[PDB]
Amino acid sequence: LVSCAIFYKFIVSKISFKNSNYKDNYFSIFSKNYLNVLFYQYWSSFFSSVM
Amino acid sequence: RVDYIVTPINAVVSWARQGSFWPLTFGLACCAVEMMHATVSRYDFDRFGVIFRATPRQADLILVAGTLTNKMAPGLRRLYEQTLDPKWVLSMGSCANGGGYYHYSYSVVRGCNRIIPVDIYVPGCPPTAEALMFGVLQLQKSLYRQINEGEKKYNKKDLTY
Amino acid sequence: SRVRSFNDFKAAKTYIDTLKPKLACLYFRADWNPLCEQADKDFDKLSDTHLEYEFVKIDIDKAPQAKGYFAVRCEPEFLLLCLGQEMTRQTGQNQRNLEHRLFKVQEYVKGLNFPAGMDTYEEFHEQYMAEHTQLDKEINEWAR
Amino acid sequence: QNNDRWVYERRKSNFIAQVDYEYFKFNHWRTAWRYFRNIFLLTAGVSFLYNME
Amino acid sequence: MLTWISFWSLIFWLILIILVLKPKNFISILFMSELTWLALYCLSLLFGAIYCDITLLSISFFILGVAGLEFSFGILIAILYKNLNESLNTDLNNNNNNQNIFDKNFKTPLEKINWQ
Amino acid sequence: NNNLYYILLYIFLEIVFFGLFLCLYQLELFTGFLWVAEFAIVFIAVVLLFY
Amino acid sequence: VLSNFEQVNLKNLRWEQNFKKLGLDSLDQTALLASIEHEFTILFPDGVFEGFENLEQVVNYILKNINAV
Amino acid sequence: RSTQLKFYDGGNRQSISGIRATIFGATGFMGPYIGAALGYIGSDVIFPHNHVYAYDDYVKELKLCAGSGQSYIMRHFNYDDDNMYDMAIKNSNVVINLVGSRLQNKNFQKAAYANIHVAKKIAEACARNPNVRRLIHFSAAGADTKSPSPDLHTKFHGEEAVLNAFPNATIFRPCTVYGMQDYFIRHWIKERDWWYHFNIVTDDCTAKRQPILINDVAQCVLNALKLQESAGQIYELGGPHVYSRLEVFEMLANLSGRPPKLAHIPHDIALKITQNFYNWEFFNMEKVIKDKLDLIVTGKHKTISDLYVQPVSFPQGAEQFIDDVRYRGVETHDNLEK
Amino acid sequence: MNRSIFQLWKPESPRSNVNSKQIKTMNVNFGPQHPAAHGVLRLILQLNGEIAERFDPHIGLLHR
Amino acid sequence: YVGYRGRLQYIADALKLFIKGIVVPEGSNKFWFVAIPSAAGAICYTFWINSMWGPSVSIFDLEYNLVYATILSILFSFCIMLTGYFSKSKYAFMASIRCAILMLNIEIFLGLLV
Amino acid sequence: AVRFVGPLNIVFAGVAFLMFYENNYKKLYLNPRYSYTMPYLQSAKITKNLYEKL
Amino acid sequence: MNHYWGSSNTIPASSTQNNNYFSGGGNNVTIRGNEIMERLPSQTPSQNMVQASMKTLRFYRKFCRLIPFILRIHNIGTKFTAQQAMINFGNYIRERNHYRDPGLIDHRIQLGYELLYEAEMHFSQHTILMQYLSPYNTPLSDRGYSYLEKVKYGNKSKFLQGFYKGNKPTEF
Ligand SMILES: CCCCCCCCCCCCCCCCCC(=O)OC[C@H](COP(=O)([O-])OCC(O)COP(=O)([O-])OC[C@@H](COC(=O)CCCCCCCCCCCCCCCCC)OC(=O)CCCCCCCCCCCCCCCCC)OC(=O)CCCCCCCCCCCCCCCCC
Ligand SMILES: CCCCCCCCCCCCCCCCCC(=O)OC[C@H](COP(=O)([O-])OCC[N+](C)(C)C)OC(=O)CCCCCCCCCCCCCCCCC
Ligand SMILES: CCCCCCCCCCCCCCCCCC(=O)OC[C@H](COP(=O)([O-])OCC[N+](C)(C)C)OC(=O)CCCCCCCCCCCCCCCCC
Ligand SMILES: CCCCCCCCCCCCCCCCCC(=O)OC[C@H](COP(=O)([O-])OCC[N+](C)(C)C)OC(=O)CCCCCCCCCCCCCCCCC
Ligand SMILES: CCCCCCCCCCCCCCCCCC(=O)OC[C@H](COP(=O)(O)OCCN)OC(=O)CCCCCCCCCCCCCCCCC
């Protein structure tokens, strides 16, 4: 249950900020941090739970 | 000889395919309405066991009911070729038969028989609902008789060879 | 080494398979490209110099099947085979580049250390057919 | 195009057709049968014969 | 040939080995994780029957629920892959050379390195 | 096998064989519950593969 | 690629002469450049495509290009 | 008599070609093509047939050869009545015969009947009718009295009888004709699809083949009609190059992308089985017998060059007919669009 | 009831992957031989989730 | 009129469906195109085992009749989805997706009823 | 004597036949036979007692 | 760009990516785009024959870039090679090269783009659309040609050839 709650906390992390960078308005910038966090947390939880 | 079994089975097959004769749900022009009129209660098609199917794969009859345009002729050819065999074609209306009112046009094909083999023709413009019913019933009778039209010859023992 | 010229695909393939060279240089030519005239001379000149390569010459016009079998796209074509396995391929006539490719292939083969009993010669199509059975056959069996 | 670069430069060799005279012999299945009967005999047949005796 | 206890004890870790072995495609790993949960389900039922343990028998539905929740999370992450611009085949998300892949090849998004 | 559809098919067959073992061991109720619970998962997996 | 265009003689081919000297009008030039693009699996920007005047320039551009297959 | 034929070939279906033609045996693979060759220039075409089942597309599509008022179908034809032939060719100045023993028939008596009796009666009817300017009988390449194949054995006698009855008859001897509805490419595709693992051969596959396109055959027929001097001579029609059966298999495999696999059945056992069991299109003794025999163009008679038709090479001609049946291996994402 | 505008519309931004067609849309030939179509309408429909997006009607199949 | 007063209409249609020829699209997968309907027919003709005609008048002594019904329905939905997918018609594929949505709704609805 | 099948195949056939015959023999003659296990070999009479040999 | 030819109308290379994890790209020049063409705005008016000629060259360039895809989808590669089709369409344009009206040229370019889009999207049939790609005086590559007429009328004027051929049915 606590692991599900922590996964909820990681899911609700803020992604996009209103910063002072005005150079990427019309270009695609790829950031994988969100997926990496979710992927590793999910699979670590799976391995620990099964074991 | 196989004829002993083939001939009665031929009769059964012809009867079954006559009883279940599903045309394709395909209408192009005013002749469509006449087809609908035959389908509806006043001249029920279902009495003679004809039920329309949307996909050509599940159709036995191709009702070319309406004018055929050059912009559509390849589509009609593709539909006819994609319809599963065995199949028959019934042209309905003057436009489907020989170009009808638009025989002198620059867009209309002068007859669906130029693109498709037409098994039967139903004259009219539009053909009456009873006219379409008559054409369908005549096509069914011809279809039933097509299996054995006395092609094979009888030998001295009256068995076809 | 001297260039062995073939006009029949069956004869050329049989000779190569029987010889089982460790290092082979196949030169495919057709009469449509004018540069084959100089390519033949370059190939002959390099054949004498390089004793470690079996130099084979094939005329695509006389052996149409050779083009398809060896996957020749443009000509003149030079193909380097190590134990009958494609190492490098050159398109066009350039003696310096051809000799450089021969030098690179031979030095790499010298550096290689194959396991004992597992370095026998293989026909050109064996690797392509293995990869085909591994990937393309399954793809076809899934789709169409 | 760089995604499909490998397919573009892949060298494909045309097939050579030969007649297969031993296709219907099913040599791989014959080998499987030989292995199966050898193992079956050595273990099950010996054990059964001794136990039956 | 094998007793059920040894068979299930072994195949659980065999399933884990398969999960690790297969190429890392998120959907495939999710299916393997589901299979692992079901192997645990079967093993727990076997031990519950052997030892007359209602707790072991009842672990079945707990495993089913945890597996369902994890599968829901996996579906969501697999869908999120699209918005994050990540290939489901994780091995294609990095430039490290891999001999296990026939056609892995990445170039810088340029047309000419030298202009003069 | 690397094809996702065949992987899912083999997972489904593995579920069937697990149910068969449970039936042989006489846990029929758990076999039925497992099958009903997991066939829906396989169905959703097929939809996900279509997507 | 040029072998398809039978107006030009590949034997005595000067890589510095213009397409017009080779015997190719604008349409023949456009067709030839498109064929070369197909052969090398590349795409010439509009400026360079219209700026090409002979085969030597095309050869140099393709040599500089790294995406050519 | 006069063999001259004045016709105009510059018109479309609605023109008046000037040819009135009766085409016996047009329900086969080549019948619709030959009929359409004459019909598309405005010629009148008659198709006498006694075919089962009547509703078959083979019979139905013959009406598309010429059009309305130009193509006629004569059903329930009797092949042993001279009056029937007289009626069929009464108004025809061209008489084409394609009535040959089918690949499905192994009975020597039936094969001889089809290949001799019908041909001789057609030739006799042409002789009786003085308005029949041209007769074009279709024989088979490799026809010989010593030929093991009953089809070829009877076809040699059939062509001899046709020449005897109508000395101005033109005899064609096509090689293995291929096309969309052929018995060669379609049979290859269907056999490989039904087995999925091999094509069953019954010989060493060294027999020579010289395939010719059906369009080329139709063009040859038109050129023969145009050329008056072609009357009374035998022609052998084939492709530019000669291939063995193994080479044909290799070419088809390379073109379609399907890996080749030939599974060998002993010739003797195959012959016994096919001659002692029921035979249909895909299982017949004629195919087994003709596998070993060579069906190529010999220099003993006139060739296609005499008719002035340049046949297309087999690799080029047969490529379009195998587009749908193509091996689906590794392909580019652009190619995935289809 | 809360807002759902963002779940209901998806605009396209210049050279943006997220604000773009991230899917291969279904280009269906609605008609002419379709029970719903009257018979001579060839509507090229761009479906995305079975929701119409783009219409390209061809109506010349009955021009006479 | 198919049989006196239409007494043999169903027999006629069944025989006609048998008679009608079939062709598999070249682009479609030959194996699956035929395998899916075969499995669907097997499942449909297995349906009747889960039926009772009296206090204990059943072909088999099954207890989990509702579980059997749910499993068989899920299998038939699987077959319909696979049919739509392997027949590459876009309309068929959309029909398969609709079948998936119907199955999703049926799960909860029938589960709550049970 | 001459045999198309190999000696090992003959041995396999013999041992398999012995297994089959011995299994059936022990199941048919060394069993209480109070339960109807082999149809057409055990009687199908109606038993009025708990133990009646079939 | 909100147009059928826009750089964002490419077909994605993957369900979750466009051709890469570090870049975004797609092919829309040699194949049809992802979204259908809902509107094709009229070519901006050309005030000069220079602009008209530029439009013609750009349209021909697009046609040449698309011809291999058209041939592959329509299964007409055997009839003619890609370069043969390009040269045949070049002859088609050459027959019209005498135009000197910018408005007429713009209208013609619009029609050409429309027909090219139809060929891409399979709106037309291969037999109906190959009339533009067919050789003017060369045999089709998938058929055996007849040189009987050339043999009979070798080294004879076109007038004499036509005189012998005729221009009217002789039956009536
Ligand atoms: C129950 C009582 C209790 C006791 C037990 C009793 C026995 C129980 C048996 C249970 C299993 C029954 C299975 C069969 C069910 C019914 C169907 C059937 O019979 O097959 C017809 C059926 C027709 O094919 P189809 O797919 O329906 O056709 C689709 C379209 O028509 C095709 O459309 P297309 O457009 O693609 O057309 C292409 C062309 C075909 O495509 C081509 O153009 C290329 C091929 C042309 C030549 C074909 C020659 C025949 C090839 C036979 C292949 C057999 C398969 C195995 C081959 C192995 C090779 C290593 O079309 C055709 O010609 C169709 C095929 C015609 C086949 C004619 C002969 C069929 C009957 C005889 C078969 C004998 C096979 C023996 C195998 C060995 C057995 C040990 O399928 C087959 O032909 C294969 C049948 C294989 C099993 C035969 C089982 C009976 C004989 C067993 C041996 C004797 C008994 C041993 C046990 C004794 C115990 C006491
Ligand atoms: C598909 C329907 C049936 C499925 C279920 C069947 C029952 C359950 C499974 C039982 C196992 C059956 C496996 C057969 C596989 C045969 C594969 C094959 O042909 O390989 C040939 C292969 C290849 O044949 P090859 O080598 O001649 O040809 C290939 C040649 N090269 C290598 C050059 C390419 O032979 C081998 O090398 C490996 C043979 C392994 C044989 C294993 C037999 C079974 C072993 C266990 C026996 C246990 C007996 C216990 C008895 C107890 C008392 C009763
Ligand atoms: C419910 C009804 C089921 C009916 C199934 C019938 C099975 C086939 C019965 C064959 C009977 C043969 C009787 C003796 C023949 C004597 C002639 C002879 O020469 O024998 C060798 C015959 C003759 O073939 P042949 O090619 O060797 O020689 C031709 C004959 N001569 C030489 C005289 C010209 O061949 C055979 O092997 C037997 C006949 C095979 C027939 C195959 C087609 C059967 C068609 C069945 C149609 C009904 C389908 C029913 C199901 C419909 C479902 C919708
Ligand atoms: C009381 C129970 C009543 C219900 C029983 C229902 C059983 C009906 C069985 C009908 C006959 C089916 C064929 C069995 C004979 C063997 C067939 C065979 O050759 O197998 C080879 C194939 C597999 O091998 P293959 O030859 O296709 O390819 C091998 C894999 N490659 C090529 C990549 C190396 O078996 C099948 O796939 C048959 C499937 C038949 C349809 C079954 C549908 C079941 C419902 C859906 C299950 C979940 C699917 C999820 C994934 C999406 C789909 C992929
Ligand atoms: C007189 C009264 C009765 C007496 C008892 C009779 C018992 C029945 C007969 C038993 C013997 C059967 C024949 C056994 C032959 C074994 C041959 C062998 O092992 O050679 C390897 C064999 C050949 O390889 P292959 O692929 O076929 O190619 C041919 C190459 N020449 O390769 C193979 O084919 C596979 C071989 C598999 C070997 C498995 C070994 C299992 C060993 C289990 C332990 C046995 C220990 C001994 C027990 C004795 C007890 C008394």
Ligand SMILES: NC(=O)C1=CN([C@@H]2O[C@H](COP(=O)(O)OP(=O)(O)OC[C@H]3O[C@@H](n4cnc5c(N)ncnc54)[C@H](OP(=O)(O)O)[C@@H]3O)[C@@H](O)[C@H]2O)C=CC1
């Ligand atoms: N590969 C090829 O196609 C080759 C063909 N030929 C010759 O060209 C001819 C035409 O080619 P193709 O279409 O392939 O041949 P087919 O076998 O398809 O056609 C033969 C025609 O003759 C009819 N026929 C067969 N037997 C008889 C009979 N006893 N009595 C009356 N009519 C009969 C058939 O009608 P029905 O449908 O009623 O049986 C059919 O219309 C061949 O017959 C053959 O003689 C020569 C070399 C190669």
Ligand code: SF4
């Ligand atoms: S024949 Fe008459 S009623 Fe029928 S479609 Fe033509 S105009 Fe309409």
